[PDB]
Structure formats: structure tokens, C-alpha cells
Amino acid sequence: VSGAAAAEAALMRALYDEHAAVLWRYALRLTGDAAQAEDVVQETLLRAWQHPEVIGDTARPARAWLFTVARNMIIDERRSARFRNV
Amino acid sequence: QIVERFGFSEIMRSTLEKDNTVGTDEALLDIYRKLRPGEPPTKESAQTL
DNA sequence: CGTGTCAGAGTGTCACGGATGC
DNA sequence: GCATCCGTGAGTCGAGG
RNA sequence: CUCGA
């Protein structure tokens, strides 16, 4: 029903309150730019919303899946486009 | 034990009274929310940092 | 491309005025 | 009704990094 | 950064 679609938005708002602020300090050390870390956080949680497999098992650490997704985004941002210009 | 150590001065008696929150697990979370805001405050996540 | 422990910044100015705020 | 705090300003020119 | 009036 209509209350079932609102439970999906209340589920995302939950993982924000426990992981977003901790994930932000992880990307900040990897990049050094605070405004870049916020970009990494939004992209990471966006993939969590697109991967129901990572939001399924709470008995499996979901915080860690974020730190490696953030690792892969920063190592990809760390390729050719950054290489010349930055 | 705080009043026992800082009792000889009246400026410290006015500090524990004007204080807002009391409790070992209470002022430990008060420090956590001003130091690392936006994070869930656990009695053992502030005991760690 | 896929992604499932966690690892986490700079700090020795000041005078002065007026909007900002308990 | 007022103490607080924010934002503003703080010589000019020249040579090499 | 370092110096010249």
C-alpha cells in the first residue's frame, strides 16, 4: 500500500544516522577535501539503495560494504582524469 | 570526589552547581555529540575515543 | 568491473562596530 | 531589554623562488 | 618563501 513505500524511505533514513557521518570521516582522509567526501558519501549510499542484497542481512556487517565501495570510488576518481589536471 | 578535591575555592563550587548534566554515562555522551556530531552516541563509542 | 573488520583535519593578530541571540 | 559574536579593516614599490 | 627603499 502507500505505507509500504514510506517504509523504504524510513529504512534509508536509518542507515544515514548510523553510517553516513562515520563514512564521511573515512573518505576525508582518503581524499583530503571535505567537499569531495560528501560527494563520495552520497554516491556510496545511492548504491546501497540500489543493492537490496546489502540492506537485506543485518546479521552481516553492512558498514564494511560501504568502506570498500568508498575505497573503489576514490581509487577510480584517482585515475586518468585526476592524473593530469589535479 | 570532585567536591573533595576542589572544595577550597568558591569558583569550583559554582561550577558543579551551574553544571547542566550529571552522570558518568551522561557527560561522556555530551562530549561525544559536540566532538563528533552526527553520529550515534554509544556509552562505549565515547569510552573508546 | 565488484564491493561486506576497521584505519578519522588546522590551532601566537586585534580594534571596532552592529546585527545576532538567551 | 543587553551581552555575544560576527565580519570588517590593517603602506607603497622593486629583485629572485 | 627570501630580500632592496
Please tell me the distance from the alpha carbon of residue B27 to that of residue B35, in angstroms, as a whole number: 12
Q: How far is CA A22 from the centre of its chain?
A: 10
Q: What sign does the dihedral B21-B24-B26-B28 (CA atoms) show?
A: positive
The answer to whether the beta carbons of residues A74 and A30 sit under 8 Å apart is yes
Quote the cell numbers at residue A37.
567526501
A20 touches chain B (CB under 8 A): yes
Query: In terms of DSSP H, where are the helices of A1-86?
Result: 2-15, 21-31, 34-50, 52-56, 62-77, 80-85
Resolution of the experimental structure, in angstroms: 3.8
Nucleotides of C strand lying within 7 Å of any protein CB atom: 1-9
Domain that holds residue A44: 1-86
End-to-end alpha-carbon separation of chain B, Å?
A: 24
The count of structural domains within chain A is: 1
Please tell me the distance from the alpha carbon of residue A10 to that of residue A7, in angstroms, as a whole number: 5
The answer to whether the beta carbons of residues A70 and A40 sit under 8 Å apart is yes
Number of CB pairs < 8 Å for A and B?
A: 11
Query: In terms of DSSP H, where are the helices of chain B?
Result: 2-5, 10-18, 24-35, 43-46
Please tell me the distance from the alpha carbon of residue A30 to that of residue A41, in angstroms, as a whole number: 12
End-to-end alpha-carbon separation of chain A, Å?
A: 49
Could you identify the residue whose CA is nearest to the C1' atom of nucleotide C4? Answer: A65
The answer to whether the beta carbons of residues A63 and A22 sit under 8 Å apart is yes
Residue-level length of chain B:
49
Q: How near does any CA of chain B get to the CA of A83, in Å? A: 33
